[PDB]
Amino acid sequence: GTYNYGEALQKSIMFYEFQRSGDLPADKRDNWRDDSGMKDGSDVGVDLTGGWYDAGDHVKFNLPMSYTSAMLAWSLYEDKDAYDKSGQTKYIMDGIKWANDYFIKCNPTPGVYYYQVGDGGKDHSWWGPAEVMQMERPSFKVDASKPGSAVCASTAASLASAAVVFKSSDPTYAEKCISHAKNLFDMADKAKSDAGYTAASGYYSSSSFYDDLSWAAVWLYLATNDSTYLDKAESYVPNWGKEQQTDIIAYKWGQCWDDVHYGAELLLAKLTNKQLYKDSIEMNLDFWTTGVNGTRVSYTPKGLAWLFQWGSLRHATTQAFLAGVYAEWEGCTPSKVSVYKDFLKSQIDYALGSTGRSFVVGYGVNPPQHPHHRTAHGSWTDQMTSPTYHRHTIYGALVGGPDNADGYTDEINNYVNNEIACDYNAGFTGALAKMYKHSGGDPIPNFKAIEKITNDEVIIKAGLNSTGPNYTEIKAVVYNQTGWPARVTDKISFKYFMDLSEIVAAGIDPLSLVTSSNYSEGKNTKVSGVLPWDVSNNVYYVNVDLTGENIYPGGQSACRREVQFRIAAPQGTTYWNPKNDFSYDGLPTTSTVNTVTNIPVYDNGVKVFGNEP
Amino acid sequence: TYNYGEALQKSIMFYEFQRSGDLPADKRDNWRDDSGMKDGSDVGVDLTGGWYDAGDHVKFNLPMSYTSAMLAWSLYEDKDAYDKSGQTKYIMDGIKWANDYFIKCNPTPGVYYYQVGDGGKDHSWWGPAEVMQMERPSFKVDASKPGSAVCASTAASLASAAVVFKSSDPTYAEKCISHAKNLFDMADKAKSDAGYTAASGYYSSSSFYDDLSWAAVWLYLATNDSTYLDKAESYVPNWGKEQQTDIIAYKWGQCWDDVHYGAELLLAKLTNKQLYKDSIEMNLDFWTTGVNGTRVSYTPKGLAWLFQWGSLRHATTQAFLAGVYAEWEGCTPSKVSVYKDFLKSQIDYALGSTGRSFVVGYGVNPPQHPHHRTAHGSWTDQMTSPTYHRHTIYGALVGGPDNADGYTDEINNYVNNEIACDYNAGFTGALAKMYKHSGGDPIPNFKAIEKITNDEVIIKAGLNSTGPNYTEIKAVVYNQTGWPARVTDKISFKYFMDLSEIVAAGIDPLSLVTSSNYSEGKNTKVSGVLPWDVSNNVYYVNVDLTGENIYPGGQSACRREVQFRIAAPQGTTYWNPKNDFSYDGLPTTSTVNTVTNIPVYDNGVKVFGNEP
Ligand SMILES: OC[C@H]1O[C@@H](O[C@H]2[C@H](O)[C@@H](O)[C@H](S[C@H]3[C@H](O)[C@@H](O)[C@H](O[C@H]4[C@H](O)[C@@H](O)[C@H](S)O[C@@H]4CO)O[C@@H]3CO)O[C@@H]2CO)[C@H](O)[C@@H](O)[C@@H]1S
Ligand SMILES: OC[C@H]1O[C@@H](O[C@H]2[C@H](O)[C@@H](O)[C@H](S[C@H]3[C@H](O)[C@@H](O)[C@H](O[C@H]4[C@H](O)[C@@H](O)[C@H](S)O[C@@H]4CO)O[C@@H]3CO)O[C@@H]2CO)[C@H](O)[C@@H](O)[C@@H]1S
Ligand SMILES: [Ca+2]
Ligand SMILES: [Ca+2]
Ligand SMILES: [Ca+2]
Ligand SMILES: [Ca+2]
Ligand SMILES: [Mg+2]
Ligand SMILES: [Mg+2]
Ligand SMILES: [Mg+2]
Ligand SMILES: [Mg+2]
Ligand SMILES: [Mg+2]
Ligand code: NI
């Protein structure tokens, strides 16, 4: 049971690059993600482009998004040596900056914070790649009158933690992050309410904000060194959730997007050395390991600390991270250090392959093949079932995980065991960095996700629609099956080649033949008259132009354009011979079209599919 | 402000968890059992019983008798509090538990066993009382080797017990008196602690005239024979004085080593002489308002702090004496409220006035790591494992904070976090008085039947070595018993296989060869292949550990490793471990892990794992 923690780490970081929204950098290392959500914020007149899509959807939910970047920054703060040695420092910093540059955009003026872009209902009702989304993507904000303490504080924490890890390499950016972190924190602190945080209801409803206030205050303290914030962080503790039948700080759950008091108390213990926080975090970690006060988290037969049905791996690997960080602190109860470090490894190893298979996409043995993800799947027909395989490998994604009995099924709509999301990989990345520091495992040098194109991106299918002594009528259908990256193809055209030697010999002008279209989709489709290709050899063709048609891989009608065209010799004549026409050879009889390779398709004049005579 | 009745109830219960010997069937806990069952066997005397002193298992009669004497004093002073709280039965059972033991320790006139167990050997092992393996020698005093303090302290315990048992059990009261008289005679004739040596380093005595007066006072109350009152008073000029003065010491407090405080309090009530009234009030004043420019230290949060060791023990004991004296008609009127305020303030500090309780299993945020072997319940002779106490020793008052209220709840801090008999003695009496004054209902029908929080007996296994014709298993059984901790000498386990392939090969499953390369216990017996459910071709290998002295008291002690193999004829290739029930999930390495398909039995009863 040996696992390459370095490779797992580099892939977990790369996962977020695949989640990026906005104007993607020229230096990206994949060939399947491209610009998307480019009009984000346009509905309110604010540039809100950037950030990460939440899960297998394209909504930008700022609570889990900010929780994610705050956790990544925490990891970099605790283990920079791991990121430097593994050569991954540059990549995680770029990811941290990607999320935070967007949060800065979301705080355009003091007192205003945009916390979501996209409508859950509108976004989830379409199954296709991010690059060609066609639906409205509304922007939502909170302010003094419509407060969002949890999301504002979670974002302040992300910005503040970003400042901590960026201060050394670029103080100006760190300074800017702190400025926005302070405003968002003040908004959250004064309001003490999530009343205005409504667009995320049912997706990321907030069940607490005092935890976020402490978490944000702790990070502002670390970024500014102003104890004002440390006092504030401690002041919220009495208001944190407690254990039902006692008056003790809650300890039977774990660090997650909705509950960050575990991370806050862990850091408060390290920063103040106060018994209360040491007792609290150890009660939580003990519950996750050896058990405490006659209570322990459930464990699957195969060794996974199982909190509950949704994202079991997410919870276990996040706790593994906290256990690892706390175990290295001098204040940790000496007798628990080994228990905590063993827990860190056991849970991470479960995710990586201890049961005989990996739960990380594109990593290890038998990794998940069908994670619930729209863009990685790459349907061009708005169907979760087509194609029957994922066209892209979204490296590093940690799936939800098995049930309490280690039961797991790899299906695209097992939206409970196979979901993937930013928050699922956040603590995981931190735990991996800690294990790499402990046990190594070499990352793949200069790793990239430049995929081989596995299906022809723009094709054409054709068949004989009608025939007569003086004519041939073809039914052709062009299909946009683009995926590298998925894209609108509005400059497509195709050519139908004929040998008109028989027309010339009959004493008829080959360029005089009547071309026509019985039917076609698209206001712009244009069928040319007969044009010369290689006159010396009597080869001519008909050009069918679809330029202007916004064909995109987002539905049956969307991805295609059918065009029926005919070429006719004079009425009443019988010398027309389609049998010596290049494009007629092997042409499917009947109108039941089949893919053909002798009716070449061009993209902006460049042949991309099929052959010429 | 606090529930004094519940506190009182649990403080009494504390002693039940300290009990050594053959425990009663009416026991209200499921984690303590018979222990120290051979106590006295080295001298041919049944010396079983009594209370273990602190977080250890030595029976130190000086603090033990001080404790029971103080508990009886409380019952004598406040029977009405015990009756109303419905705890009378429980404190009387405790008082009798200690005194029945002291009686056993006085087997013949002039002979007194004052200790069972050796501090050095007892403290060198960290585990539950029920499975102690070390020798526990008995020690005695007699005319040639005297122990005046321990003999008189025991006489006081027995005589005070007689006073409170006289009404309900006059015969036992007489029994206690008979023995009290003999031990006091021993102490009075000898006037020396020269032979009291086995407790050196733990409870060495620094005075015995105080014990002589304390015993004489109780013998007088028990017998009404003026002879004893005269003796009690005759020892006063021999009590320790305050340095450079002829003043009876007043700057310390009532405790196992110095009982002149309790003796003078009682002598004041019994004789009304000014000498005694002045002396006890000088002590109480020193502890409250201060006196002659001197006063005990107080912590910022209100704790009268006497000494680093057991600060709570001293403060709550003085609280008890203050309460008793304050109620007496002879107490200076103006000091009555002062003394009663002190009683409440010191008790409230112990119960939770600083924001947390210093009483195990009581109030808000009580101590979780008291220095106590059996409550912790380690099965590996490790103070550090497990990292939490497997049992809740209700009522135990911890040592207490430093002079700045600093307190660290950790198992290894035996100075501020140990618990002991004497720590709860005066405490119990002060609690009875607070209950009488402010109430607080005890918990109805309270018992300490805990849920089993860890599998008491488990087995871990792994694949030792394999082959095309065999499977070799390495398994380790572990005794992690705690309810109660116990020797598991009737343990066995079964390894199940499906031998359909053997039958199909024309071979007799019962002919396969079983063997063992390594075995930890000398009684380990690995059977040949046996039938279990032949209808489904299920056979098994039975591994019997019966006879093994497996106990929760050490890394090697609690476990037994067994490596066994089952093999088909050499050269054959039909052996298939995959359809074997016990092979499923088996760690494919010599590194073992907890498994649930190799069931463990205790006297034939399956206690861990599943069968096919
Ligand atoms: O009281 C117990 C603890 O509850 C914690 O709160 C829980 C809450 O009780 C529970 O219902 C949700 S389930 C939640 C899941 O955690 C998210 O990861 C998941 O995300 C969805 C997203 O909503 C979808 O839009 C996309 S398509 O898929 C992702 C897949 O993950 O949504 C689920 C439903 O909202 O989790 C809460 C957090 O753990 C409290 O935080 C804790 O304090 C207490 S003790
Ligand atoms: O000089 C001032 C007064 O001294 C009194 O005598 C003191 C003595 O000087 C002092 O050393 C001890 S400290 C002692 C403590 O009292 C015990 O309760 C404690 O018990 C230990 C036990 O020894 C261990 O075997 C077990 S595992 O743990 C328990 C934990 O409590 O041991 C401590 C060290 O031996 O206290 C004496 C009594 O107060 C005189 O009695 C007094 O007259 C004078 S004025
Ligand atoms: Ca929260
Ligand atoms: Ca032709
Ligand atoms: Ca003495
Ligand atoms: Ca078999
Ligand atoms: Mg660009
Ligand atoms: Mg570090
Ligand atoms: Mg603790
Ligand atoms: Mg019995
Ligand atoms: Mg079978
Ligand atoms: Ni598949």
PDB file of N, CA, C and O and ligand atoms in Angstrom, chain A residues 61 124 202-204 207 253 256-259 314-315 424, ligand 1:
ATOM      1  N   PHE A  61     -20.838  29.911  -6.497  1.00  0.00           N
ATOM      2  CA  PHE A  61     -21.363  30.021  -5.122  1.00  0.00           C
ATOM      3  C   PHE A  61     -20.207  30.492  -4.238  1.00  0.00           C
ATOM      4  O   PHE A  61     -19.339  29.700  -3.868  1.00  0.00           O
ATOM      5  N   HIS A 124     -28.656  24.374 -13.678  1.00  0.00           N
ATOM      6  CA  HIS A 124     -28.731  22.919 -13.622  1.00  0.00           C
ATOM      7  C   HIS A 124     -29.655  22.274 -14.642  1.00  0.00           C
ATOM      8  O   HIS A 124     -29.556  21.068 -14.893  1.00  0.00           O
ATOM      9  N   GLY A 202     -30.851  26.034  -0.370  1.00  0.00           N
ATOM     10  CA  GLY A 202     -31.034  24.688  -0.884  1.00  0.00           C
ATOM     11  C   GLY A 202     -29.784  24.142  -1.554  1.00  0.00           C
ATOM     12  O   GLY A 202     -29.703  22.948  -1.856  1.00  0.00           O
ATOM     13  N   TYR A 203     -28.820  25.021  -1.804  1.00  0.00           N
ATOM     14  CA  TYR A 203     -27.558  24.615  -2.416  1.00  0.00           C
ATOM     15  C   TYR A 203     -26.482  24.757  -1.350  1.00  0.00           C
ATOM     16  O   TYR A 203     -25.786  23.792  -1.005  1.00  0.00           O
ATOM     17  N   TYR A 204     -26.362  25.967  -0.818  1.00  0.00           N
ATOM     18  CA  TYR A 204     -25.382  26.236   0.216  1.00  0.00           C
ATOM     19  C   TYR A 204     -25.952  27.138   1.307  1.00  0.00           C
ATOM     20  O   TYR A 204     -25.368  28.157   1.654  1.00  0.00           O
ATOM     21  N   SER A 207     -25.964  27.712   7.976  1.00  0.00           N
ATOM     22  CA  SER A 207     -26.562  27.374   9.260  1.00  0.00           C
ATOM     23  C   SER A 207     -25.798  28.044  10.397  1.00  0.00           C
ATOM     24  O   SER A 207     -26.089  27.799  11.567  1.00  0.00           O
ATOM     25  N   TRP A 253     -18.873  17.045  14.413  1.00  0.00           N
ATOM     26  CA  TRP A 253     -18.947  17.220  12.962  1.00  0.00           C
ATOM     27  C   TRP A 253     -17.505  17.451  12.496  1.00  0.00           C
ATOM     28  O   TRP A 253     -16.575  16.893  13.075  1.00  0.00           O
ATOM     29  N   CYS A 256     -15.831  22.305   7.375  1.00  0.00           N
ATOM     30  CA  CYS A 256     -16.460  22.276   6.055  1.00  0.00           C
ATOM     31  C   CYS A 256     -16.927  23.680   5.676  1.00  0.00           C
ATOM     32  O   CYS A 256     -16.847  24.615   6.485  1.00  0.00           O
ATOM     33  N   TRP A 257     -17.410  23.827   4.448  1.00  0.00           N
ATOM     34  CA  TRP A 257     -17.851  25.134   3.961  1.00  0.00           C
ATOM     35  C   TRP A 257     -18.877  25.827   4.859  1.00  0.00           C
ATOM     36  O   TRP A 257     -18.905  27.057   4.936  1.00  0.00           O
ATOM     37  N   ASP A 258     -19.691  25.039   5.556  1.00  0.00           N
ATOM     38  CA  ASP A 258     -20.755  25.580   6.412  1.00  0.00           C
ATOM     39  C   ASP A 258     -20.347  25.726   7.879  1.00  0.00           C
ATOM     40  O   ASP A 258     -20.994  26.461   8.639  1.00  0.00           O
ATOM     41  N   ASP A 259     -19.271  25.046   8.267  1.00  0.00           N
ATOM     42  CA  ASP A 259     -18.806  25.081   9.657  1.00  0.00           C
ATOM     43  C   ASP A 259     -17.287  25.142   9.766  1.00  0.00           C
ATOM     44  O   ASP A 259     -16.598  24.132   9.646  1.00  0.00           O
ATOM     45  N   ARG A 314     -14.809  13.893   1.386  1.00  0.00           N
ATOM     46  CA  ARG A 314     -14.577  15.316   1.628  1.00  0.00           C
ATOM     47  C   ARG A 314     -14.377  15.557   3.130  1.00  0.00           C
ATOM     48  O   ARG A 314     -13.411  16.207   3.555  1.00  0.00           O
ATOM     49  N   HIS A 315     -15.288  15.027   3.942  1.00  0.00           N
ATOM     50  CA  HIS A 315     -15.177  15.217   5.388  1.00  0.00           C
ATOM     51  C   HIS A 315     -13.979  14.510   6.006  1.00  0.00           C
ATOM     52  O   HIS A 315     -13.266  15.096   6.831  1.00  0.00           O
ATOM     53  N   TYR A 424     -14.761  19.779  -1.785  1.00  0.00           N
ATOM     54  CA  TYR A 424     -14.343  18.384  -1.604  1.00  0.00           C
ATOM     55  C   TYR A 424     -12.816  18.270  -1.705  1.00  0.00           C
ATOM     56  O   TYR A 424     -12.194  17.475  -1.005  1.00  0.00           O
TER      57      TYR A 424
HETATM   58  O1  LIG C   1     -26.368  19.249  12.390  1.00  0.00           O
HETATM   59  C1  LIG C   1     -25.308  18.505  11.811  1.00  0.00           C
HETATM   60  C2  LIG C   1     -24.292  19.420  11.155  1.00  0.00           C
HETATM   61  O2  LIG C   1     -24.924  19.986   9.986  1.00  0.00           O
HETATM   62  C3  LIG C   1     -24.023  20.793   9.215  1.00  0.00           C
HETATM   63  O3  LIG C   1     -24.699  21.252   8.099  1.00  0.00           O
HETATM   64  C4  LIG C   1     -24.830  20.310   7.019  1.00  0.00           C
HETATM   65  C5  LIG C   1     -26.306  20.099   6.699  1.00  0.00           C
HETATM   66  O4  LIG C   1     -26.947  19.519   7.798  1.00  0.00           O
HETATM   67  C6  LIG C   1     -26.460  19.188   5.478  1.00  0.00           C
HETATM   68  O5  LIG C   1     -27.806  19.150   5.101  1.00  0.00           O
HETATM   69  C7  LIG C   1     -25.612  19.683   4.293  1.00  0.00           C
HETATM   70  S1  LIG C   1     -25.721  18.543   2.879  1.00  0.00           S
HETATM   71  C8  LIG C   1     -24.978  19.587   1.582  1.00  0.00           C
HETATM   72  C9  LIG C   1     -23.527  19.180   1.304  1.00  0.00           C
HETATM   73  O6  LIG C   1     -22.757  19.384   2.454  1.00  0.00           O
HETATM   74  C10 LIG C   1     -22.952  19.986   0.138  1.00  0.00           C
HETATM   75  O7  LIG C   1     -21.655  19.556  -0.149  1.00  0.00           O
HETATM   76  C11 LIG C   1     -23.857  19.790  -1.081  1.00  0.00           C
HETATM   77  O8  LIG C   1     -23.367  20.492  -2.174  1.00  0.00           O
HETATM   78  C12 LIG C   1     -24.028  20.252  -3.438  1.00  0.00           C
HETATM   79  C13 LIG C   1     -24.602  21.564  -3.977  1.00  0.00           C
HETATM   80  O9  LIG C   1     -25.610  22.017  -3.115  1.00  0.00           O
HETATM   81  C14 LIG C   1     -25.170  21.373  -5.389  1.00  0.00           C
HETATM   82  O10 LIG C   1     -25.515  22.618  -5.921  1.00  0.00           O
HETATM   83  C15 LIG C   1     -24.140  20.691  -6.306  1.00  0.00           C
HETATM   84  S2  LIG C   1     -24.843  20.314  -7.930  1.00  0.00           S
HETATM   85  O11 LIG C   1     -23.687  19.462  -5.724  1.00  0.00           O
HETATM   86  C16 LIG C   1     -23.036  19.662  -4.449  1.00  0.00           C
HETATM   87  C17 LIG C   1     -22.490  18.316  -4.015  1.00  0.00           C
HETATM   88  O12 LIG C   1     -21.723  18.440  -2.827  1.00  0.00           O
HETATM   89  O13 LIG C   1     -25.168  20.281  -0.778  1.00  0.00           O
HETATM   90  C18 LIG C   1     -25.808  19.529   0.278  1.00  0.00           C
HETATM   91  C19 LIG C   1     -27.192  20.122   0.456  1.00  0.00           C
HETATM   92  O14 LIG C   1     -27.124  21.529   0.642  1.00  0.00           O
HETATM   93  O15 LIG C   1     -24.244  19.882   4.693  1.00  0.00           O
HETATM   94  C20 LIG C   1     -24.106  20.832   5.773  1.00  0.00           C
HETATM   95  C21 LIG C   1     -22.617  21.058   5.994  1.00  0.00           C
HETATM   96  O16 LIG C   1     -21.980  19.886   6.480  1.00  0.00           O
HETATM   97  C22 LIG C   1     -23.536  21.976  10.048  1.00  0.00           C
HETATM   98  O17 LIG C   1     -22.639  22.743   9.300  1.00  0.00           O
HETATM   99  C23 LIG C   1     -22.852  21.462  11.315  1.00  0.00           C
HETATM  100  O18 LIG C   1     -22.480  22.545  12.117  1.00  0.00           O
HETATM  101  C24 LIG C   1     -23.803  20.540  12.090  1.00  0.00           C
HETATM  102  S3  LIG C   1     -23.046  19.865  13.607  1.00  0.00           S
END
